[PDB]
Design a protein around this nucleic acid. Sequence first.
RNA 1: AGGACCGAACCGACUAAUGUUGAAAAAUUAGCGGAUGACUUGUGGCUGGGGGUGAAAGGCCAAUCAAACCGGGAGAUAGCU
RNA 2: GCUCGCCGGAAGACCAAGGGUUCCUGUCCAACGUUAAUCGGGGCAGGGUGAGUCGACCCCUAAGGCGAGGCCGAAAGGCG
RNA 3: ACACAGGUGGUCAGGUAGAGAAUACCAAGGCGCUUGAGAGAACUCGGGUGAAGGAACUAGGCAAAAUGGUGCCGUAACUUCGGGAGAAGGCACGCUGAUAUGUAGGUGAGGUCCCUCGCGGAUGGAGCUGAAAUCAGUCGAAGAUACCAGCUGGCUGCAACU
RNA 4: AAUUCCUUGUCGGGUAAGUUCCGACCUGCACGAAUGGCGUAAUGAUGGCCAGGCUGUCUCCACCCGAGACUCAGUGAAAU
RNA 5: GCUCAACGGAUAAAAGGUACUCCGGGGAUAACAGGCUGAUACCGCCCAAGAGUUCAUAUCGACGGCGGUGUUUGGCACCUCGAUGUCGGCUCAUCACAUCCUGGGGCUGAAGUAGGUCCCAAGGGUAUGGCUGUUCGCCAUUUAAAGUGGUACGCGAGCUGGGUUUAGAACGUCGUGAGACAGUUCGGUCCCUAUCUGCCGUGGGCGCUGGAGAACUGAGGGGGGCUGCUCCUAGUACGAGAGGACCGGAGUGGACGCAUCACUGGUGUUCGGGUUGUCAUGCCAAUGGCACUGCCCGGUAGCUAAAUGCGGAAGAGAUAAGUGCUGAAAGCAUCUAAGCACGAAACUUGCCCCGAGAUGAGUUCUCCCUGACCCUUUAAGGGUCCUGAAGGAACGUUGAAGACGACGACGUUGAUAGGCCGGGUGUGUAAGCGCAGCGAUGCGUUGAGCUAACCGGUACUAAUGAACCGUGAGGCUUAACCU
Lengths: 56, 121, 120
Amino acid sequence: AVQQNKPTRSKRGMRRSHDALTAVTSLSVDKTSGEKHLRHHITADGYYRGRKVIAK
Amino acid sequence: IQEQTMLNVADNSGARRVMCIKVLGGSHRRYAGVGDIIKITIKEAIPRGKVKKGDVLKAVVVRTKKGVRRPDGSVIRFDGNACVLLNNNSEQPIGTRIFGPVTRELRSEKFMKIISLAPEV
Amino acid sequence: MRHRKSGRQLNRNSSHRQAMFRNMAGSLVRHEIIKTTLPKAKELRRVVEPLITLAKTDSVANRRLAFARTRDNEIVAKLFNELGPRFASRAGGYTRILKCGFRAGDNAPMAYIELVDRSE
RNA sequence: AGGACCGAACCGACUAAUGUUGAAAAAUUAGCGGAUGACUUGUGGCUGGGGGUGAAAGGCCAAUCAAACCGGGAGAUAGCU
RNA sequence: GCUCGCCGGAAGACCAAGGGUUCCUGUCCAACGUUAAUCGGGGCAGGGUGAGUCGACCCCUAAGGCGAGGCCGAAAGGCG
RNA sequence: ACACAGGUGGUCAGGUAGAGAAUACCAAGGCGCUUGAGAGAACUCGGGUGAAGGAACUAGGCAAAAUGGUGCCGUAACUUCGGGAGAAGGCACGCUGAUAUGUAGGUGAGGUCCCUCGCGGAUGGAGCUGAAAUCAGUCGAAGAUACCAGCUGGCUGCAACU
RNA sequence: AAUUCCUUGUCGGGUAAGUUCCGACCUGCACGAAUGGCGUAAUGAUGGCCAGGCUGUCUCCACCCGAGACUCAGUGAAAU
RNA sequence: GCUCAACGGAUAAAAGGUACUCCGGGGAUAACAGGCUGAUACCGCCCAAGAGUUCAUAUCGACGGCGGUGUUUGGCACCUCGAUGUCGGCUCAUCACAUCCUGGGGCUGAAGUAGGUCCCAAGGGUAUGGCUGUUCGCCAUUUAAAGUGGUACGCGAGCUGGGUUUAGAACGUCGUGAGACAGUUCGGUCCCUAUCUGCCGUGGGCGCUGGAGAACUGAGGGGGGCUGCUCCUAGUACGAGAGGACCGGAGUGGACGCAUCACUGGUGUUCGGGUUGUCAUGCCAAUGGCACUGCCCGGUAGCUAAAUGCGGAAGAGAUAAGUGCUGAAAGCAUCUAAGCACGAAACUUGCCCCGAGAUGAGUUCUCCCUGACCCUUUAAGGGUCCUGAAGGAACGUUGAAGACGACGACGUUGAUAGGCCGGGUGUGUAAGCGCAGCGAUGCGUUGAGCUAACCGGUACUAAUGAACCGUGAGGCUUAACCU
């Protein structure tokens, strides 16, 4: 249940080795407005692929 | 059928309600109900029957609510659980006349007499 | 396990799921474009699109069925008068889902579900 | 008429499960007992520590009881750690 | 704003205790709120509580308390 | 100690079903309980339903399952004559129509008569309300249809009992 | 026997099988008449046993429905 | 002048209970467990008086003897009293062999059947109930058998608390009494969110020497090893009869394990219907909410078992107790010494699963990259520009894969999901209208209407073109081969 000896900062780092965030690595650029968006996502001005899908 | 199972009696000499104290045949056999032989106590008996209350002797299950499965997939289910009383040493029918339906699964060895006496097979 | 099974529980009971899908389908018929989380939109397709396939045929029993589902007579009237002729030649896919940005309160994958031939 | 009967409020606490770093320093959820009386509850008051009170259990006397709590003797004493 | 669900001998409404400004309006979101907060019982100002009839006060007692004198007790004090 | 699943005296008490302040659904009125979004492993908690057997489980029927309401039959051993006794066992329950354009019963406007002639009485006798029963029909597998609502009997120890 | 060590005494009974139970016998280690003796209808959230109904208690587990557990965002302890 | 006799004399003068207990210490000192020992206990061997008709050893073994195990009662007090939970049951095991069954043998006072005793052998298997808290034990009925021991008398950070083992109460006995019992009876709180090792599953990084995609070899490791009954041989052998083959065959089961859902069912809160009470959509009708899914009645997919298929083998190698052949030592003799042949569920293979992180990192097939410059502290390097290959990764639609990663299918050269069309299934003749009926209701339209997770089709909706990672011919020494 409880630890019997205190874990080291080395063991803390080895456990946290996989708690490293993943970057997006690719941001899609829309044709009719060259603003960047998440791929398969709207452009935050309202465009998907070449068309203004949402007015807001 | 199982242990602590009450059964009706098909044959006349066997009397009324009987209970399965042991499922004979097998080391840890739990459930046996088609042509199997089970050790039987007589929990309640009429005096016209030859056997009496508190007596242990064998029986063979003839009717089961679970029912037999035929080779083509047919399931004959008989309402009620029934047994034909048999002697402990001989495993031969005590009752002279068998009552109710019987199955063709009871066609082996001493059960030929049971299907011979019983009307509907 | 979940093998060849359909429907999303969405962490609610069946009465709440039916109530949300009725209210949601009414909102989609009224506004024709709504913002909802992406799993809820995917399950919304299966409740809105049968109503339009009902509404392609206009009869008293069909109006009663589309009232028994969604329990809103204005949604029934819109489904049978305005939509239906809007989607009569169309063979399915009346609702279209566009994934949008994550919700600020909790990181939920969000989307916009809309009727396909919306004017604007 | 009934320290009568079934049963809500109300009073209590028989069994079980959960909780047991709890939602809670004894509760929750199903069932349980009593429920016109030796019943219950509000507001005041009275009884004070080798004393009170007790349909009695070493029970209760402010989450404390085989002699409450607070200050003083007091830096008691400790052949023990 | 439109639907949905819950309580409805209450999770509705009012007196008493108890709290003491938590009520209302405006502004802000550092800290508190087991999250975000534009919101708040949070911060900061400013308002608001109007009685011959409602309570208190008051007049009168109960259990009981105090109790001039008095009886008693080493003193404190006990009883009346 | 907390924006704590606890504790906290009194007042009011709508409709329908119902004996009811139970319970169910709702009025008036107030709330969704100050973290959410997904997936739908084990395992845990709270439930529903299970072939055949049925207490073989277990320290023990612990727990679940079961019975449950009204009316009417009936109903013991012992007894302290009260009991035991809802003993046990059971049957009828829905809707429609007729009896009866809604009956038994309740309540009582007019008219009339009498009188202390007015908050008077008398066959006052229209409306309103109205339960139960009998007969016949009719639906379902099922009519206490939900919530609610008892498991029953026998032998013994102890304590009379509340 | 709420008491009997030996002891699971012995007879009758209940179960296929009964160190439990009931009626007892009397060989009472070590009952006994207000420290009451013995019976007793009713009553008991009392002790022991049997039976019927009933069933996931069990054979022997299976599916489904919700709250956790798993993943993502925010806040973020503990004993040791 | 002292039985100050506890005699170096606490004072003239002093008994007990504590389970209501509290405090300071101790493993200086008992209870559990471990540890030493093994008297006792269990097992084995030695001598053989004898019982066995005679015959010590078929089987038992007198009086005595010698060991082995740690295995019961003990001995000790080494360890923990600044805490190692107590029997039993449940769940899950694992080992030894002093073997209960099954396997192989020897002797038999072994005719057969069935036995006794001893040797080899641990692969697998090795009951359910009545009683009681019970391990036990006794009993009922099975079975091939219902093994004996170790594992903190296995297992309470896994479960239980029936028992001893607190606090309430009573009975019997003891004591004047408080109370006590190596007696009885009733009741009596069982905490933990897993750091490390360990296991069970599933992944990231890097390595394996250019980088990829696949198929493998198998070094190792794991699983699985049970057995009954009926018949044929055969009423044969054997036998005074009664009875009756423990070779070789075939079928059918019990238990166990794996897979699957075609059947038989179970569930199926996401399908259909009945129906109680109430509320609502104005109302009639039709519906929806709520009451455990309100209560039910059926039920598709999926999962499942009780349903269905299959398997534990045959064979080969080397063996164990045992049985031998040839054969000297020791002219005979002898299973062994030289040789040689048999021989079991044990061992190694054979069957099934993982498996090259097998750092000993293996093999085979295929794919893809062959441009310059600058500096340099040159087995070697660093940088710049151009170039990004096969492929992976990401993103999206998703799955009979899944906790998450992972794995698989698809991405407009598209059937990957939802929708749509048709069918199947399931429920049971919808709404509305008409007719009959005083009405409830019935009849027709109508096996109607709804219908899921299923089957077959269909781009209607979403799977955008990019972008990212990965590069630009791969070290140094030595051999057949050619300059």
